[PDB]
RNA sequence: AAUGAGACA
RNA sequence: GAACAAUAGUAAGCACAAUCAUAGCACAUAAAAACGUUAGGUCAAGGUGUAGCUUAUGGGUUGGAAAGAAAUGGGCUACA
């Protein structure tokens, strides 16, 4: 699954370069604390459990 | 064609209650008032008795609009205990969860 | 200013706040003093829930064998 | 106006006439149910009223046979309904007034004494000498510039 | 033993839907409500009528939509406006669905009295979530 | 306001002490029109017009 | 209580637009019938039931145009249909038991 | 590149009647979901500000509404089945309002308000005294 | 009546009752196989008992470059569906 | 058979303004949004699901519409319909000072297809005594005459109409109820005159 | 702390 | 079908576990608890197989289901 593994690295930092785009802020300093900011408004998911919100991460942080 | 033949008569009874509730409106109230002559409210009782009987909101039976249950009916959501959980147990309420604390 | 609770709720709370507010005033020595005696320390026991289907918060009905 | 669907996106100019006449013949089937079923429909739960989603009539409300009646026949695009009945109102000897006289004509005038165009029930000179337009046109006691 | 609304494990040769895989007391801890309107409110009336208008839906979209329905629908109403939201497999051509989408739309507004929305997302099957 | 409509009645009888009630209750009344509280005040015009020989041996004369 | 209290409760009375002269205690039961809204006025009671009668006349008909497709109705005739060929049947009118 | 120019077509028509001033104006939405209600104060905030408006935000406590049901369709009576409905709260307070900015903020805000959310405004309009008092009457 | 009815799994999964503690330890001798029978497997989205000719589902929208528009069958054509069918 | 078109989503500019693809409140569409979102519980070993097909997205009132890109775009556009607050009405005590009637309305927005809410129909007006002009004898007969309306406090007075059906029958009736008590604590009565010495406020 | 089972493979 | 100074077992699925709720954590309580057992309970929530009724086991109106010799279970109030 190394394939798999490099098509979401480099999606991810497109999405990135999008999300940065529609926040009107610096994409070269949207760092993840800012994107998980910015998930948590556009997707204001209400629900207790915390693994269950919606995530955008790091695919190697991500996948096992 | 309602749920069953129990449900059909509450309908025929609720129709008959509306259009008779200013009527026995106006009569109940020279009864239910002590200042007017007592044989007045005698006449009062024979005419309001006089009305047909489907006309009387006593009789009006609350039960669940899916299946007609006449008791364990929630008055807020017009439903049954049954179909309550049924509808609430597969999300399809909002804001109706399990409860825990 | 207490409120809320009964005689006894009202008396342990103003004790507790007493012991966290004459901190300030007394050396660090005998604040660890004032730990061991249980002065600092918030009681946790707050009164339980009751059950459905039992008389009380640990009482059940009486369960009749035969 | 299309789904945001790719599968129900169009993919070209053919596809969008066909799309979009599919949708649009779905509220003329819609409709046709309303109308062929009114007492289906008359329940209102809408505060404030919206008179443009109730059901509508065709049929005429008044089937009596009098002036009044005869207009509702004219004003709901009917030429043999009305036609009939004036015809009707002539043999009575009720009085008829030009005005509506001539809106009688002007309705059967524009589709040459036929029914408009409705969901369900070029060369060459479409006007006729044997016309009913005509004929009435005699029969007017007094004709005015209109 | 518990059974509402629950699928029972039969081997590994069963696919289940992400809203079927969760217990009804993982609501509002893993899945949300697939209907959100005012009625359920603290101090808010009209909850009946919004109710059995719900099931309503629910029997008439799986109806008009024979076997291409993939799961539930979601029902959304902000003003006087009903959102329909829905999942619908490739079983028809395209041009039966703008038809339906048109009848759909047509009928229930003169039916409720009210504007309404059908917006569809379309997959080419079930989406499988465990087992399988 | 609602004394215009009480104009016919008997001013000192027992009628005027009922009447007034139900014009009271029709004033804190938000449910009912205008048109609607006339047909209560007018019904009671009906009913005691209606039934004038029961008042007479009541035991007081009542116009 | 004094006459100086009796007239400022009167006058308050007649202000707000309550009852001025001294009411019984059963007596007020008449203010409070029209101050109301009768029981069975309500749009609680009289609109409880949702009308079934339009909902399965209008579904029954969509189904015979086509336009909706019952599962439930199409089990219910499917079996008797088989119930036919089985030959057992609803017998017409004076036919049950009179032979 | 190509772009409509000049699509934008409102007339405000300024008419001689003085505007009507709101001395406070409190709005309260209510929902089910902590998430939305939090997006949407931030939405609401944003808007404020940039219309100049120093609005304060404040939650008000919270409350829950319990009842039980039977568990069985028959008998079985020691077991229950117990249900929750959640209602939070949000208030979003305005002060110093005129009448033609609060019909603009309350459309703006009503128009965008979330599907699972419903709330209440509470205007407080200030005027002076009326005609018969002002006048000197005995 | 139309909130009483229910879905066809539902319906088959219950009278087919080949769930319940009958075929367990051999305490069903029925030895009869009860089939399950898909009623939709002759489906025609817009077909109906009055016989309507919708323009989308059954019939072709466009006809000769011209849109149709609804229309009924004939007595004698919709007999023969049937007989199909 | 018919096959699927791509996404727009490989269509998507980098620097594209996002507003204009959502104008108004729209469901998630998988498609139509660039951003790749997985949301639900995942498996015991494995990652969340995906945003095609996935119903947790669809549930969520979406936000997308309201960037703060956009915003500042809608907001700025609605700055001509407005007029300035007067700057000499800053000071909460003036306002009192110049206006000394505040008259409390609600509005009610729910989903449904009525809005009819009879709560609605409440009107609640606050006046403050001290910017009167009632008279030593007059101003004490009101307090007598109101009751339970008037604060000894705050020395404010509460209106409450709830009996017409409509919110300006009520504002006209409340307002009404405020100018015929003020005109009745200034006509001294014969009667006045018999006070008794236990009713006396002082 | 003696007794109990019938038309379940 | 196991021996850790290891002698035939292996990695996943469900359940337990962990997590979540009771607005800090902790503890505690809730909630959860598979596959099966008792042909356990419910054709009277509702649907439905099979069998039965069809001027009747169907529908409507009016009036009426009393009463405790006695035995027992769970409760409230007491016997200060
Ligand atoms: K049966
Ligand atoms: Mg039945
Ligand atoms: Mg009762
Ligand atoms: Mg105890
Ligand atoms: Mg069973
Ligand atoms: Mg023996
Ligand atoms: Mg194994
Ligand atoms: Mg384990
Ligand atoms: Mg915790
Ligand atoms: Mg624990
Ligand atoms: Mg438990
Ligand atoms: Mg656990
Ligand atoms: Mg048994
Ligand atoms: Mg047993
Ligand atoms: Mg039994
Ligand atoms: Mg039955
Ligand atoms: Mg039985
Ligand atoms: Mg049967
Ligand atoms: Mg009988
Ligand atoms: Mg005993
Ligand atoms: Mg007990
Ligand atoms: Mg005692």
Redesign the pocket.
């Known amino acids: 699954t190394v394939d798999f593994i490099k098509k979401q690295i480099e999606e991810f930092n497109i999405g990135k370069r999008h999300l940065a785009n529609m926040m009107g802020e610096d994409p070269e300093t949207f760092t993840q604390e800012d994107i998980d900011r910015a998930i948590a408004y556009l997707f204001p998911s209400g ?5 269950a919100r919606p995530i955008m991460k790091h695919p190697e942080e991500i996948f096992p | 064609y309602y ?4 449900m ?2 509450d309908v ?1 009874r609720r129709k008959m209650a509306y259009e008779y509730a200013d009527e026995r409106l106006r009569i109940n109230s020279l009864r239910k008032n002590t200042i007017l002559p007592k044989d007045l409210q005698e006449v009062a009782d024979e005419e309001i008795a006089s009305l ?3 006309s009387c909101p006593v009789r009006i039976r609350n039960r ?1 609009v ?4 006449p008791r ?1 009916v929630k008055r807020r959501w017009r439903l ?1 205990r ?2 309550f959980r ?1 509808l609430a147990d597969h999300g399809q309420l909002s804001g109706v969860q ?4 | 200013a207490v409120s809320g609770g009964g005689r006894s709720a009202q008396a342990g709370a103003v004790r507790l706040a007493m012991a966290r507010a004459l901190c300030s005033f007394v050396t660090e020595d005998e604040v660890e003093w004032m730990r061991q005696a249980g002065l600092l320390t ?1 009681d ?1 026991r707050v009164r ?2 009751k ?2 289907g039992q ?1 009380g ?1 640990r009482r059940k ?2 369960w ?1 064998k035969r | 106006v299309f789904q945001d669907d790719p599968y129900l996106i169009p993919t070209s100019s053919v596809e969008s006439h066909s799309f979009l006449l599919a949708k649009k013949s779905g509220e003329n089937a819609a409709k046709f149910i309303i109308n062929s079923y009114p007492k289906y429909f008359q329940k209102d739960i809408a505060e404030p009223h919206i008179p443009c989603l109730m059901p509508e009539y065709f049929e005429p409300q008044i089937e009596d046979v009098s002036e009044a009646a005869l207009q509702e026949r004219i004003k709901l695009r009917k030429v043999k309904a009305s036609v009939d009945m004036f015809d009707q109102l002539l043999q009575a000897g009720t009085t008829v007034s030009l005005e509506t006289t001539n809106s009688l004509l002007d309705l059967l005038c524009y589709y040459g004494n036929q029914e408009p165009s409705a969901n369900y029930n070029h060369l060459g000179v479409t006007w006729r000498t044997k016309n009913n337009a005509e004929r009435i046109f005699a029969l007017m006691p007094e004709k005015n510039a209109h | ?2 059974r509402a609304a ?1 699928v ?3 081997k ?1 040769d069963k696919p289940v839907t992400y809203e079927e895989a969760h ?3 993982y609501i509002a ?1 893993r899945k949300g409500w697939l209907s959100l309107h005012t009625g359920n409110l603290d101090g808010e009336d009209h909850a009946a009528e919004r109710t059995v208008e719900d099931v309503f839906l629910r029997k008439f979209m799986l109806g008009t939509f024979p076997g291409c329905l993939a799961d539930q629908l979601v029902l959304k109403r902000r003003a006087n406006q009903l959102e329909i939201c829905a999942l619908v497999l490739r079983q028809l051509p395209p041009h039966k669905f703008y038809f339906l989408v048109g009848y759909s739309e047509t009928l229930l507004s003169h039916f409720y009295k009210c504007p309404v929305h059908l917006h569809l997302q379309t997959v080419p099957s079930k989406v499988v979530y ?2 399988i | 306001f609602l004394d215009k409509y009480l104009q016919d009645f008997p001013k000192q009888g027992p009628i005027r002490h009922f009447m007034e009630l139900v014009t009271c209750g029709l004033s804190k009344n938000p449910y009912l029109s205008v048109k609607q509280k006339v047909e209560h005040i007018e019904w009671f015009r009906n009913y005691f017009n209606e039934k004038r020989v029961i008042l007479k041996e009541s035991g007081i004369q009542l116009n | 209580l004094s006459e100086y209290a009796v007239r400022m409760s009167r006058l308050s009375a007649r202000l707000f637009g309550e009852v001025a002269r001294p009411t019984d205690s059963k007596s007020m039961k008449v203010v409070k019938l029209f101050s109301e809204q009768p029981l069975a006025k309500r749009k609680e009671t009289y609109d409880w039931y949702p009308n079934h009668n339009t909902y399965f006349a209008l579904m029954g008909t969509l189904r015979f145009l086509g336009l909706y497709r019952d599962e ?1 109705q199409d ?2 005739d499917e ?2 249909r ?2 036919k060929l ?1 030959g ?11 032979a | 590149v190509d772009v409509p120019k000049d699509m934008t077509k409102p007339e405000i028509t300024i008419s001689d009647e003085p505007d009507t001033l709101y001395k406070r104006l409190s709005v309260l939405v209510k929902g089910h979901d ?1 998430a939305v209600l939090d997006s949407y104060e931030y939405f609401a905030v944003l808007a404020a500000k940039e219309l100049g408006i120093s609005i304060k935000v404040h ?1 008000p ?2 409350k ?1 509404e319990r009842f039980t049901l039977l568990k ?5 009576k020691k077991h ?3 249900y ?1 409905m ?1 209602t ?1 709260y949000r208030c979003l307070e305005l002060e110093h309002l005129t009448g033609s900015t609060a019909d603009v903020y309350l459309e703006y805000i009503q128009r965008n308000l979330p599907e699972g959310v419903a709330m209440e405004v509470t205007k407080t309009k200030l005027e002076q005294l009326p005609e018969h008092i002002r006048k000197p009457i005995w | ?1 139309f909130f ?3 879905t066809a799994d ?2 088959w ?3 087919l ?1 080949e769930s ?3 075929a ?6 029925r030895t009869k196989k ?1 089939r399950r029978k898909d009623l939709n497997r002759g489906q025609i989205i817009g077909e109906g008992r009055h016989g309507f000719l919708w323009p989308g589902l059954n019939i072709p929208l466009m006809r000769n470059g011209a849109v149709q528009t609804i229309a009924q069958r004939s007595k004698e054509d919709q007999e023969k569906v049937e007989a199909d069918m | 058979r018919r096959k699927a078109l791509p996404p727009r989503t490989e269509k998507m500019a980098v620097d594209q303004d996002w507003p204009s693809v959502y104008p108004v409140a729209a469901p998630f569409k998988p498609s139509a949004v660039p951003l790749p979102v997985r949301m639900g519980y995942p ?4 990652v969340p699901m995906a945003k095609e097909g996935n119903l947790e997205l669809l549930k969520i009132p979406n936000f997308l519409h309201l960037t703060p890109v956009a915003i500042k775009r809608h907001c700025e556009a609605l700055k001509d319909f407005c007029t300035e607050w007067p700057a000499a009405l800053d000071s909460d005590e003036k306002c009192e000072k110049h206006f000394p009637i505040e008259i409390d309305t609600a509005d009610y927005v729910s989903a449904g297809p009525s809005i009819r809410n009879p709560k609605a129909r409440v009107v609640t007006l606050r006046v403050k005594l001290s910017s009167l002009n009632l008279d030593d004898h007059a101003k004490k007969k009101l307090i007598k005459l109101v009751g339970d309306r008037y604060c000894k406090s705050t020395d404010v007075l509460t209106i409450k109409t709830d009996r017409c059906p409509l919110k300006r029958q009520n504002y006209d009736y409340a307002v009404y109820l405020l100018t015929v008590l003020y005109h009745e604590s200034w006509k001294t009565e014969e009667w006045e005159k018999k006070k008794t010495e236990a009713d006396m406020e002082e």
């Open positions: 629900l207790f459990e915390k693994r | 749920v069953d033949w129990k059909l008569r025929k047909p009987r489907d669940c899916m299946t007609s249950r364990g049954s049954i179909v049924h399990r409860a825990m604390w | 918030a946790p339980e829930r059950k459905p008389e918060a009905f009486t009749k | 033993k518990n629950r029972r494990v039969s590994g217990a009804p007391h801890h465990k087992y | 439930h089990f219910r079996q008797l088989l119930k089985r057992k049947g609803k017998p017409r009118k004076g036919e049950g038991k009179r | 902590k939650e406590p919270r829950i069985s369709v028959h008998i079985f229950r089945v117990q929750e959640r939070l | 009546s009483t009815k229910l539902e319906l999964k219950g009278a009752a319940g503690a009958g367990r330890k051999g305490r069903g001798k009860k | 498996v015991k070993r494995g």
